[PDB]
């Protein structure tokens, strides 16, 4: 009823915007009045918040021109920098394609500046990458050495600057000054003036503050702080040390177990990934990421029916997606479920918010029309992922293997030649492309292609032959 | 104040440096695209914000120093007070004039190098 109280139950009940509508109102009413106006800058604050430790987008500058890894060529297997790209899809020359994207990962990293200009702006990052990673209350006019003597408005008003204006400096100076305030004191403190170092740049002095915080008091935040920084640093041993230590303190955390599952994955030794997403769904049975995580892996190796039990998991928790639904139409046609095959992929191309997404599933309805024969309506299924998505280069390669079927050479050359264009990465269209120059002659393109091939896949058997009758055939 | 200030200008020079990372990649771009007018206007950003950041280079390499100083100072007035004496009396001022600034306690300090 009253406005205070009624702003303040709307902050409670998670509104906000009509939190802020009253206190604007009780604002202008009274210019003395700072409970609404800590209650304003909470909820505006909180309309935008977003926790730093999932926010790790480097981009581009920080992938070549920042080096903070001690060893430059480290053994393989203590650095960050399954099945075959025969079965799974990839999306690098390895780094096969992943469940769950977060805006975390990096996904192998570009060589030089121009490579990663010339590539495509989301094939290094869940997001397009970027070189660098009226008003409430105008930054430059509060004096921070007076806010910073009252802590209670001292918190919410770093939380704002912090997660809503994005000023890091002033941010540093707030919490600066309420650090020595608190007589280096609070770990909350320490742990802001770290994230503020941590997105300035300075990972030691971050790392820093998050361990002289972790020594005030344990907490999961922290904890996932510090692995960030070592992380950062280019070491997953000692983030992995850590995260037994934050289990040994809480002894079944489910953020610290997936850690330690996507530490092992990025170094990708997937036998104890899986091992630890076990463990989060011991602990949770509704984690998404394990759970998505475990799924891909029981599809790729050839158990489409176990992946189909963990995908109807997610089905049965109120999670509704054009991913999902995808997912159970390629699991439900793979483990050989007729009936609720075709509909799953019905509800995708109803769920799909993009153009990409539309073009993901009228491919994998291609897939399921070339694996039930009548190669006409793969045909349109893949041209149709085309019309929607122009780059999308396994729709070429398909489409050109058909084509091929059909007979039409030329049209199945060039389409192999834009996949491989698009995507060199991948080895279908350069191993479909050396095959048939090779069956029409032309051994020149044809190793041209087989090496390329060779250099996406190395492990391949087919391109060795090839490329050894070719090199026969040059002598 | 110099460790303030050492902090503000820390702070300040590695949001220079971003802005030179982020720079640096932008003027890539250009050349690459063979767009020489923003490429001259990217060097022209990083030339100015290169002799910003020499500058807060001056200035933070003089209060580092100045710090250097106060601190051996410090650590010379804490040896010259135990140094007065022999024995055991020389052992725990040390330790008391080190427990007597991690608490910034300085005239419960001055008492200890004053008699101990």
Same mark, same amino acid.
């Given at each position: 009823?009253?406005?205070?109280?009624?702003?303040?139950?709307?902050?409670?009940?998670?509104?906000?915007?009509?939190?802020?509508?009253?206190?604007?109102? &009780?604002?202008?009413?009274?210019?003395?009045? #700072?409970?609404?106006?800590?209650?304003?800058?909470?909820?505006?604050?909180? &309309?935008?918040?977003?926790?730093?430790?999932?926010?790790?987008?480097?981009?581009?500058?920080?992938?070549?021109?920042?080096?903070?890894?001690?060893?430059?060529?480290?053994?393989?297997?203590?650095?960050?920098?399954?099945?075959?790209?025969?079965?799974?899809?990839?999306?690098?020359?390895?780094?096969?394609?992943?469940?769950?994207?977060?805006?975390?990962?990096?996904?192998?990293?570009?060589?030089?500046?121009?490579?990663?200009?010339?590539?495509?702006?989301?094939?290094?990052?869940?997001?397009?990458?970027?070189?660098?990673?009226?008003?409430?209350?105008?930054?430059?006019? =509060?004096?921070?050495?007076?806010?910073?003597?009252?802590?209670? =408005?001292?918190?919410?008003?770093?939380?704002?600057?912090?997660?809503?204006?994005?000023?890091?400096?002033?941010?540093?100076?707030?919490?600066?000054?309420?650090?020595?305030?608190?007589?280096?004191?609070?770990?909350?403190?320490?742990?802001?003036? %770290?994230?503020?170092?941590?997105?300035?740049?300075?990972?030691?002095?971050?790392?820093?503050?998050?361990?002289?915080?972790?020594?005030?008091?344990?907490?999961?935040?922290?904890?996932?702080?510090?692995?960030?920084?070592?992380?950062?640093?280019?070491?997953?041993?000692?983030?992995?040390? =850590?995260?037994?230590?934050?289990?040994?303190?809480?002894?079944?955390?489910?953020?610290?177990?997936?850690?330690?599952?996507?530490?092992?994955?990025? &170094?990708?030794?997937?036998?104890?990934?899986?091992?630890?997403?076990?463990?989060?769904?011991?602990?949770?049975?509704?984690?998404?990421?394990?759970?998505?995580?475990?799924?891909?892996?029981?599809?790729?190796?050839? #158990?489409?029916?176990?992946?189909?039990?963990?995908?109807?998991? =997610?089905?049965?928790?109120?999670?509704?997606?054009?991913?999902?639904?995808?997912?159970?139409?390629?699991?439900?046609?793979?483990?050989?479920?007729?009936?609720?095959?075709?509909?799953?992929?019905?509800?995708?191309?109803?769920?799909?918010?993009?153009?990409?997404?539309?073009?993901?599933?009228?491919?994998?309805?291609?897939?399921?029309?070339?694996?039930?024969?009548?190669?006409?309506?793969?045909?349109?299924?893949?041209?149709?992922?085309?019309?929607?998505?122009?780059?999308?280069?396994?729709?070429?390669?398909?489409?050109?293997?058909?084509?091929?079927?059909?007979?039409?050479?030329? #049209?199945?050359?060039?389409?192999?030649?834009?996949?491989?264009?698009?995507?060199?990465?991948?080895?279908?269209?350069?191993?479909?492309?050396?095959?048939?120059?090779?069956?029409? %002659?032309?051994? #020149?393109?044809?190793?041209?292609?087989?090496?390329?091939?060779?250099?996406?896949?190395?492990?391949?058997?087919?391109?060795?032959?090839?490329?050894?009758?070719?090199?026969?055939?040059?002598? | 104040?110099?460790?303030?200030?050492?902090?503000?200008?820390?702070?300040?020079?590695?949001?220079?440096?971003?802005?030179?990372?982020?720079?640096? !990649?932008?003027?890539?771009?250009?050349?690459?695209?063979?767009?020489?007018?923003?490429?001259?206007?990217?060097?022209?950003?990083?030339?100015?914000?290169?002799?910003?950041?020499?500058?807060?280079?001056? *200035?933070?390499?003089?209060?580092?120093?100045?710090?250097?100083?106060?601190?051996?100072?410090?650590?010379?007035? *804490?040896?010259?007070?135990?140094?007065?004496?022999?024995?055991?009396?020389?052992?725990?001022? *040390?330790?008391?004039?080190?427990?007597?600034?991690?608490?910034?306690?300085?005239?419960?300090?001055?008492? *200890?190098?004053? !008699?101990?």
């Amino acid at each position: 009823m009253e406005p205070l109280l009624l702003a303040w139950s709307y902050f409670r009940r998670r509104r906000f915007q009509l939190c802020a509508d009253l206190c604007t109102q &009780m604002l202008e009413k009274s210019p003395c009045d #700072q409970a609404a106006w800590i209650l304003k800058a909470r909820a505006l604050t909180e &309309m935008v918040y977003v926790d730093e430790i999932d926010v790790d987008e480097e981009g581009i500058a920080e992938m070549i021109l920042d080096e903070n890894a001690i060893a430059q060529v480290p053994r393989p297997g203590t650095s960050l920098k399954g099945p075959s790209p025969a079965v799974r899809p990839v999306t690098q020359a390895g780094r096969p394609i992943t469940g769950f994207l977060r805006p975390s990962t990096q996904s192998g990293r570009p060589g030089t500046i121009e490579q990663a200009i010339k590539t495509p702006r989301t094939a290094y990052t869940a997001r397009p990458i970027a070189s660098s990673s009226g008003p409430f209350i105008n930054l430059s006019r =509060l004096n921070l050495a007076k806010y910073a003597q009252k802590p209670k =408005l001292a918190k919410a008003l770093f939380e704002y600057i912090f997660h809503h204006e994005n000023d890091v400096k002033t941010a540093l100076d707030l919490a600066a000054l309420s650090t020595e305030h608190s007589q280096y004191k609070d770990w909350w403190w320490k742990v802001q003036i %770290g994230k503020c170092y941590y997105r300035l740049g300075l990972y030691r002095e971050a790392e820093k503050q998050f361990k002289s915080a972790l020594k005030q008091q344990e907490m999961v935040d922290t904890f996932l702080y510090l692995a960030k920084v070592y992380i950062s640093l280019d070491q997953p041993l000692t983030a992995l040390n =850590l995260f037994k230590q934050g289990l040994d303190k809480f002894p079944g955390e489910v953020t610290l177990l997936c850690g330690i599952a996507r530490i092992y994955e990025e &170094m990708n030794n997937i036998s104890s990934a899986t091992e630890y997403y076990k463990e989060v769904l011991k602990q949770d049975n509704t984690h998404v990421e394990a759970i998505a995580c475990i799924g891909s892996n029981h599809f790729y190796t050839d #158990q489409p029916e176990v992946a189909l039990r963990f995908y109807r998991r =997610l089905l049965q928790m109120g999670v509704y997606n054009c991913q999902l639904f995808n997912n159970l139409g390629l699991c439900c046609f793979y483990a050989q479920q007729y009936d609720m095959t075709l509909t799953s992929f019905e509800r995708a191309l109803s769920l799909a918010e993009n153009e990409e997404e539309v073009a993901d599933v009228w491919y994998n309805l291609g897939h399921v029309a070339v694996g039930t024969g009548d190669t006409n309506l793969a045909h349109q299924c893949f041209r149709l992922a085309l019309v929607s998505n122009n780059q999308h280069a396994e729709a070429y390669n398909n489409l050109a293997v058909l084509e091929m079927r059909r007979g039409h050479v030329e #049209q199945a050359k060039a389409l192999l030649q834009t996949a491989s264009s698009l995507a060199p990465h991948m080895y279908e269209p350069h191993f479909n492309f050396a095959t048939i120059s090779d069956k029409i %002659g032309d051994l #020149q393109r044809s190793y041209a292609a087989a090496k390329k091939s060779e250099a996406a896949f190395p492990d391949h058997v087919d391109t060795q032959h090839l490329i050894k009758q070719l090199e026969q055939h040059f002598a | 104040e110099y460790h303030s200030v050492h902090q503000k200008l820390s702070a300040d020079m590695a949001d220079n440096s971003n802005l030179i990372r982020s720079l640096l !990649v932008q003027a890539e771009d250009a050349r690459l695209m063979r767009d020489m007018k923003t490429m001259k206007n990217r060097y022209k950003e990083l030339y100015d914000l290169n002799k910003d950041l020499l500058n807060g280079y001056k *200035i933070r390499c003089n209060n580092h120093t100045e710090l250097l100083g106060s601190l051996k100072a410090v650590n010379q007035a *804490i040896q010259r007070a135990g140094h007065l004496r022999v024995g055991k009396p020389k052992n725990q001022v *040390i330790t008391a004039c080190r427990d007597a600034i991690r608490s910034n306690n300085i005239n419960m300090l001055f008492r *200890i190098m004053r !008699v101990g």
